[PDB]
Design an enzyme around this catalytic site. Structure first.
Site, PDB file in Angstrom:
ATOM      1  N   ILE A  16       0.802  -1.223   0.000  1.00  0.00           N
ATOM      2  CA  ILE A  16       0.000   0.000   0.000  1.00  0.00           C
ATOM      3  C   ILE A  16       0.838   1.278   0.000  1.00  0.00           C
ATOM      4  O   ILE A  16       0.301   2.375  -0.159  1.00  0.00           O
ATOM      5  CB  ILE A  16      -0.968   0.053   1.204  1.00  0.00           C
ATOM      6  CG1 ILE A  16      -0.221  -0.146   2.533  1.00  0.00           C
ATOM      7  CG2 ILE A  16      -2.068  -0.985   1.042  1.00  0.00           C
ATOM      8  CD1 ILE A  16      -1.144  -0.094   3.766  1.00  0.00           C
ATOM      9  N   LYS A  18       5.215   3.208   0.201  1.00  0.00           N
ATOM     10  CA  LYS A  18       6.644   3.331   0.509  1.00  0.00           C
ATOM     11  C   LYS A  18       7.585   2.443  -0.323  1.00  0.00           C
ATOM     12  O   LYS A  18       7.233   1.330  -0.720  1.00  0.00           O
ATOM     13  CB  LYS A  18       6.856   3.095   2.012  1.00  0.00           C
ATOM     14  CG  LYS A  18       6.295   4.241   2.872  1.00  0.00           C
ATOM     15  CD  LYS A  18       6.634   4.061   4.346  1.00  0.00           C
ATOM     16  CE  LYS A  18       6.290   5.303   5.192  1.00  0.00           C
ATOM     17  NZ  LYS A  18       4.852   5.506   5.495  1.00  0.00           N
ATOM     18  N   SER A  20      11.111   5.033   1.143  1.00  0.00           N
ATOM     19  CA  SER A  20      12.530   5.199   1.457  1.00  0.00           C
ATOM     20  C   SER A  20      13.010   4.171   2.480  1.00  0.00           C
ATOM     21  O   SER A  20      13.935   3.403   2.210  1.00  0.00           O
ATOM     22  CB  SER A  20      12.806   6.620   1.968  1.00  0.00           C
ATOM     23  OG  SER A  20      12.131   6.874   3.190  1.00  0.00           O
ATOM     24  N   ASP A 130       8.731  15.145  13.577  1.00  0.00           N
ATOM     25  CA  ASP A 130       8.365  15.202  12.163  1.00  0.00           C
ATOM     26  C   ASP A 130       6.876  15.460  12.020  1.00  0.00           C
ATOM     27  O   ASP A 130       6.192  14.802  11.236  1.00  0.00           O
ATOM     28  CB  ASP A 130       8.774  13.913  11.436  1.00  0.00           C
ATOM     29  CG  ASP A 130       8.876  14.091   9.921  1.00  0.00           C
ATOM     30  OD1 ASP A 130       8.845  15.242   9.420  1.00  0.00           O
ATOM     31  OD2 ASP A 130       9.022  13.068   9.229  1.00  0.00           O
TER      32      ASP A 130
HETATM   33  C1  LIG Z   1       0.158   4.046   2.762  1.00  0.00           C
HETATM   34  C2  LIG Z   1      -1.244   3.996   3.265  1.00  0.00           C
HETATM   35  N1  LIG Z   1      -1.435   3.785   4.575  1.00  0.00           N
HETATM   36  C3  LIG Z   1      -2.667   3.725   5.102  1.00  0.00           C
HETATM   37  N2  LIG Z   1      -2.932   3.497   6.513  1.00  0.00           N
HETATM   38  C4  LIG Z   1      -1.913   3.300   7.504  1.00  0.00           C
HETATM   39  N3  LIG Z   1      -2.178   3.041   8.754  1.00  0.00           N
HETATM   40  C5  LIG Z   1      -1.153   2.913   9.565  1.00  0.00           C
HETATM   41  C6  LIG Z   1       0.074   3.079   8.924  1.00  0.00           C
HETATM   42  C7  LIG Z   1       1.425   2.966   9.574  1.00  0.00           C
HETATM   43  O1  LIG Z   1       1.551   2.889  10.787  1.00  0.00           O
HETATM   44  N4  LIG Z   1       2.576   2.933   8.717  1.00  0.00           N
HETATM   45  C8  LIG Z   1       3.875   2.785   9.360  1.00  0.00           C
HETATM   46  C9  LIG Z   1       4.309   1.497   9.706  1.00  0.00           C
HETATM   47  C10 LIG Z   1       3.440   0.297   9.394  1.00  0.00           C
HETATM   48  C11 LIG Z   1       5.551   1.360  10.316  1.00  0.00           C
HETATM   49  C12 LIG Z   1       6.333   2.485  10.581  1.00  0.00           C
HETATM   50  C13 LIG Z   1       5.895   3.769  10.234  1.00  0.00           C
HETATM   51  C14 LIG Z   1       4.656   3.910   9.621  1.00  0.00           C
HETATM   52 CL1  LIG Z   1       4.038   5.471   9.157  1.00  0.00          CL
HETATM   53  S1  LIG Z   1      -0.189   3.405   7.218  1.00  0.00           S
HETATM   54  C15 LIG Z   1      -3.781   3.894   4.251  1.00  0.00           C
HETATM   55  C16 LIG Z   1      -3.557   4.109   2.885  1.00  0.00           C
HETATM   56  N5  LIG Z   1      -4.741   4.286   2.017  1.00  0.00           N
HETATM   57  C17 LIG Z   1      -6.072   4.621   2.526  1.00  0.00           C
HETATM   58  C18 LIG Z   1      -6.697   5.746   1.711  1.00  0.00           C
HETATM   59  N6  LIG Z   1      -6.489   5.525   0.270  1.00  0.00           N
HETATM   60  C19 LIG Z   1      -7.629   5.011  -0.512  1.00  0.00           C
HETATM   61  C20 LIG Z   1      -8.548   6.144  -0.858  1.00  0.00           C
HETATM   62  O2  LIG Z   1      -9.244   5.844  -2.009  1.00  0.00           O
HETATM   63  C21 LIG Z   1      -5.083   5.333  -0.087  1.00  0.00           C
HETATM   64  C22 LIG Z   1      -4.538   4.123   0.607  1.00  0.00           C
HETATM   65  N7  LIG Z   1      -2.278   4.153   2.427  1.00  0.00           N
END
Ligand SMILES: Cc1nc(Nc2ncc(C(=O)Nc3c(C)cccc3Cl)s2)cc(N2CCN(CCO)CC2)n1
Ligand SMILES: [Cl-]
Length: 284
Positions: A16, A18, A20, A130
């Site tokens: 879904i 990333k 970097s 950040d």
């Molecule tokens: C990239 C992304 N993540 C989403 N939700 C997350 N929840 C928690 C996340 C998180 O904890 N990541 C993380 C991890 C795992 C480890 C270290 C550091 C980090 Cl930051 S990421 C939703 C999303 N979509 C929804 C909405 N769209 C559709 C609309 O039509 C687009 C797609 N896309």
């Protein structure tokens, strides 16, 4: 409390995001059928970020708040590390900006929840470092939580300030760019920039090269919010964006700011924004 054999407990689904640091996948907790987000990092191609990863996992393992993305755990799987978090389906606040402007009720509502997150972290002597709309994630029903603790810092009895150059340049506090001794007041500056970002769609200096703002931010007068916005919103921004960190309010104090009290409403109203983005992305 590093764990093992993640696929015994989780199902890995599609990529879904990333990026970097690594790659992020949707997943399922096989115990509850709740959906999770899984960041997979291959550590035989680490090799310098390894210290930062260790710090990130430490911070995550110590956070427990409705306003911070829930941490399931970190799992060793052969050469790879799985960092598993709750999945938030509503998108980031940055995403929610893409179709068009927010109104001040939406801005205040989002800022209020960010502030509850910052109050939590700062009371735990942690610094996010950040803060920006990209790192503010929403559930599909409008809950708002802080995410990405990849450069988060911890204060202790023997280290009462940090001085590491980290963050994202447009949002970075002047004392961080200068690598002065700083603390949680750096997050309050970043929040100010984020307030402008939520109001205007983008932070100050956003069309300049990131390296250029590194000299401009410490020298220039602090940004202000320009345009046809309410006086309390402009004042909220001004309070945050003071060059002298000790003159910035705490997150706790900002929760009682007139802009927040007058304009913030139920988080469930943010579903309107989530729906707007879904519609927009489907037509793009
Ligand atoms: C990239 C992304 N993540 C989403 N939700 C997350 N929840 C928690 C996340 C998180 O904890 N990541 C993380 C991890 C795992 C480890 C270290 C550091 C980090 Cl930051 S990421 C939703 C999303 N979509 C929804 C909405 N769209 C559709 C609309 O039509 C687009 C797609 N896309
Ligand atoms: Cl969700």
């Amino acid at each position: 409390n590093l764990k093992a054999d993640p696929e015994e407990l989780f199902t890995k689904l599609e990529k879904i995001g990333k990026g970097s640091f690594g790659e992020v996948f949707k997943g399922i907790d096989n115990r509850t059928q709740k959906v999770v987000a899984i960041k997979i990092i291959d550590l035989e191609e680490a090799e310098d970020e390894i210290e930062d990863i260790q710090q990130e996992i430490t911070v995550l393992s110590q956070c427990d708040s409705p306003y911070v993305t829930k941490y399931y755990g970190s799992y060793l799987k052969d050469t790879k590390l799985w960092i598993i978090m709750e999945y938030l389906g509503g998108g980031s606040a940055l995403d929610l900006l893409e179709p068009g402007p927010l109104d001040e009720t939406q801005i205040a509502t989002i800022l209020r929840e960010i502030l509850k997150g910052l109050d939590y972290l700062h009371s735990e002597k942690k610094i996010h470092r950040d803060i920006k709309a990209a790192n503010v994630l929403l559930s599909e029903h409008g809950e708002v939580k802080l995410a990405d603790f990849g450069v988060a810092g911890q204060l202790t009895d023997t280290q009462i300030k940090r001085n590491t150059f980290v963050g994202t340049p447009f949002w970075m506090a002047p004392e961080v760019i200068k690598q002065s001794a700083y603390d949680s007041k750096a997050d309050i500056w970043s929040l100010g920039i984020t307030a402008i970002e939520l109001a205007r769609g983008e932070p100050p200096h956003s069309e300049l090269h990131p390296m250029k703002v590194l000299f401009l931010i410490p020298k220039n007068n602090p940004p202000t919010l320009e345009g046809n916005y309410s006086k309390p919103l402009k004042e909220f921004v001004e309070a945050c964006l003071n060059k002298e960190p000790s003159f910035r309010p705490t997150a706790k104090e900002l929760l009682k700011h007139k802009f927040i009290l007058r304009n913030a409403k139920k988080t469930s109203y943010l579903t309107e924004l989530i729906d707007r983005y879904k519609r927009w992305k489907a037509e793009q």
